[PDB]
């Protein structure tokens, strides 16, 4: 029910300014404390600031490496939170999360400032502070950021203006957070080879329509592990014949902008436990007796929202009750399987 999302993150020159926006919904924003927390890439989290509540005086407290330079304010009408970053440095580059702050104070002993903890977190926006122009080398443009329901088909485009570069071989590379870069496939500019990695060979399709100098990347069967940024890169190679030409990659020179795609995970017979509201449920076979090869399967969140898991067990061919009990919903579901026709 608690939804925290951040926006306004982009690129600002050193010494410039940028306003971050954290929209909240799903609780009482009027009396809830809010905290800003940043994390530089590949480093650790760092407490930035926090704003108090109504009777608490709307007072704000900042970190020392932030004090005076940044500024936190809240608007309890739009249910949004702002962080105004002024005189920004090359040290303030990293992800910026907002979180609903908790007020923990043990009752009976009783102490002075207690502690602060952060309950719900936002997905985080990114702020980059490194000058440059980013547009002087935009010879390769891609499609806008797409969002798909898990299982749809998304097509990533990659075009050079008119008829720009061709003698470089087209390549597709995916950038997974933390996992690093990963090569997906390529099409030789000669057109004789279109090799896709055996890993991505299931769902991915590479196409090159040469009439308009445009590259395509088809992604069907979208899972939550493909949430990443997709880059198209054209690079040189070295080819020499053998018995059947053989190609050797030289480099990946001109890179694209990177299409960010996100799949929304938020916005011997056996028995089945389908459509039960809270996770999880337990399945014991024959009132807790059958254990030889009992393969109760984990639960998945289906399109309805409720969970659905399987529970089977291997049975010999000579012998030709699953005691399911879903307590967090008050449903005693003992059942027995039998075929019929």
């Amino acid at each position: 029910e608690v939804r925290l999302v951040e926006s306004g993150g982009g690129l600002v020159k050193p010494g410039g300014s940028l306003r971050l926006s954290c929209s909240a919904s799903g609780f009482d924003f009027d009396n809830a404390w809010m905290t800003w927390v940043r994390q530089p890439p590949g480093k650790g989290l760092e407490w930035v600031g926090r704003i108090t509540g109504p009777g608490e005086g709307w007072s704000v407290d900042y970190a020392e490496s932030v004090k005076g330079r940044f500024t936190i304010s809240r608007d309890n009408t739009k249910n949004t939170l702002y962080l105004e970053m002024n005189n920004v440095r090359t040290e303030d580059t990293g992800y910026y999360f907002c979180a609903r702050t908790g007020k923990y104070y043990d009752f009976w002993s009783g102490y002075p400032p207690g502690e602060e903890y952060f309950q719900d977190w936002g997905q985080g926006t990114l702020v980059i502070v490194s000058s440059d122009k980013t547009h002087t080398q935009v010879h390769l443009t891609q499609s806008g950021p797409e969002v798909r329901k898990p299982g749809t088909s998304v097509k990533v485009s990659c075009k050079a203006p008119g008829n720009t570069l061709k003698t470089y071989d087209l390549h597709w590379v995916r950038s997974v957070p933390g996992q690093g870069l990963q090569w997906m496939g390529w099409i030789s500019h000669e057109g004789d080879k279109k090799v896709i990695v055996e890993r991505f060979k299931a769902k991915v399709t590479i196409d090159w329509d040469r009439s308009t100098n445009t590259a395509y990347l088809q992604l069907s069967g979208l899972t939550s592990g493909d949430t990443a940024v997709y880059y198209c890169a054209k690079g040189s190679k070295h080819r020499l014949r053998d018995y059947v030409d053989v190609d050797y990659l030289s480099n990946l020179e001109f890179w694209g902008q990177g299409t960010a795609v996100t799949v929304s995970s938020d916005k011997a017979l056996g028995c089945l436990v389908k459509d039960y509201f809270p996770e999880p449920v337990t399945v014991s076979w024959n009132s807790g007796a059958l254990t030889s090869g009992v393969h109760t399967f984990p639960a998945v969140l289906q399109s309805s929202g409720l969970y659905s898991l399987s529970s089977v067990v291997t049975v010999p061919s000579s012998s030709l009750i699953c005691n399911v009990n879903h307590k967090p919903s008050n449903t005693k579901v003992d059942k027995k399987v039998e075929p019929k026709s």
């Binding site: 927390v37 994390q39 530089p40 890439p41 590949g42 650790g44 989290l45 407490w47 407290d61 900042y62 490496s65 040290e91 580059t93 923990y104 043990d106 002075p112 400032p113 207690g114 502690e115 602060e116 952060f118 309950q119 977190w121 997905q123 990114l126 980059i128 490194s130 440059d132 299982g151 749809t152 590379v173 933390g178 690093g180 870069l181 990963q182 090569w183 990695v197 055996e198 069907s220 070295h238 190609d247 050797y248 990659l249 030289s250 480099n251 990946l252 890179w255 990177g258 011997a268 056996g270 393969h295 399967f297 984990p298 639960a299 998945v300 289906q302 399987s310 089977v312 291997t314 026709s341």
Partner: protein, 336 residues
């Protein structure tokens, strides 16, 4: 395939100094007349991956000369003298000799600050425990004499999840294998049951000085799991197929399941034939773990369709393409 080894994993060097990354491969990367197919790329964060060095030591156009590569055969090296500000980013090495041409792991490069380098909450970063074992991550600080500590799980590129806080307060949904304790100037978080999904960063949060309105995070701890293999025997699954029950046909849905019982390796490609044709968004799966009784896996591929669409076709198929199995052991259904 044949992959690379990128080390050191991460460096935090002072500006104006020199740095070096090494990239090691499985086999060679050399052809005739002295060529070496390997390139170096930088991904300055947010901006697209930038190319610096290609074909062993050849420097790309526009790249400053402070960037320079070396090495040959199977071990290469990249040096950056006079490291400056915007040299931050994850540096990768890519081979171009062996198809499919793969990448490395990346070396997240950071600039040492040498200013206020005194994290109020001490937190050692390297922690590893075996599978199905117990491990305790500790946090130290002067403010822990009179304040508790909250614990958070941080998987890269996602929202940090709060795990434990206060005396003995654990949120719902969070698994109960997480437990928080404290004593003296120390606060601890113990994961009694070791699961693979627990591998992430872990941060302790509390005050800085005793009696202070601010909060402070620790340095962070990268927990690492040490799962084994038990017995790695390429073993075929046992494939069955079940139809939707008639009790389910008195509603609005109808699911078709396909079973794979006790197999190895983990890889198995299941392709559904709604009517000798693939599916575009109506099939899900679920898999158990190593049963510790035979150390093999499982599979439960479900094909959920509406009842108005189930009685349409008459021949569904579950295709199992495996490594131990050679042919598409397919299982079909009828209604009699």
């Amino acid at each position: 395939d044949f992959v690379l080894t990128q080390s050191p994993h991460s460096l935090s060097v002072t500006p104006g100094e020199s740095a070096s990354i090494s990239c090691k491969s499985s086999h060679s990367l050399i052809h005739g007349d002295r060529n070496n197919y390997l390139a170096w790329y930088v991904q300055k964060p947010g901006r697209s991956p930038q190319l610096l060095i290609y074909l062993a030591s050849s420097r790309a156009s526009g790249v400053p000369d402070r960037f320079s590569g070396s090495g040959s055969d199977k071990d290469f090296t990249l040096k950056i003298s006079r490291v400056e500000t915007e040299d931050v980013g994850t540096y990768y090495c890519m081979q171009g000799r062996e198809s499919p041409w793969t990448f490395g792991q990346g070396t997240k490069v950071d600039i040492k600050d040498k200013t206020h380098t005194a994290s109020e909450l001490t937190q050692d970063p390297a922690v590893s425990v075996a599978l199905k074992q117990t491990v305790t991550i500790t946090c130290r600080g002067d403010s822990l004499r009179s304040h508790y500590a909250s614990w958070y799980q941080k998987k890269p590129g996602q929202a940090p999840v709060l795990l434990f806080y206060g005396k003995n307060n654990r949120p719902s949904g969070i698994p109960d294998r997480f437990s928080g304790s404290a004593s003296g100037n120390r606060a601890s978080l113990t994961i009694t049951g070791a699961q693979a999904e627990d591998e992430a960063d872990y941060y302790c949060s509390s005050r800085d000085k005793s009696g202070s309105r601010l909060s402070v995070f620790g340095g962070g701890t990268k927990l690492t799991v040490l799962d084994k293999t038990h017995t790695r025997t390429v073993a075929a699954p046992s494939v069955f197929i079940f139809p939707p029950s008639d009790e389910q046909l008195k509603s609005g849905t109808a699911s078709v399941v396909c079973l794979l019982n006790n197999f190895y390796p983990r890889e198995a490609k299941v392709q559904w034939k709604v009517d000798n044709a693939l599916q575009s968004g109506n099939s899900q799966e679920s898999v158990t773990e190593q049963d510790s009784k035979d150390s093999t896996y499982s599979l439960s591929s479900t094909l959920t369709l509406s009842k108005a669409d189930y009685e349409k076709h008459k021949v569904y198929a579950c295709e199992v393409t495996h490594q131990g199995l050679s042919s598409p052991v397919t299982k079909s259904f009828n209604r009699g």
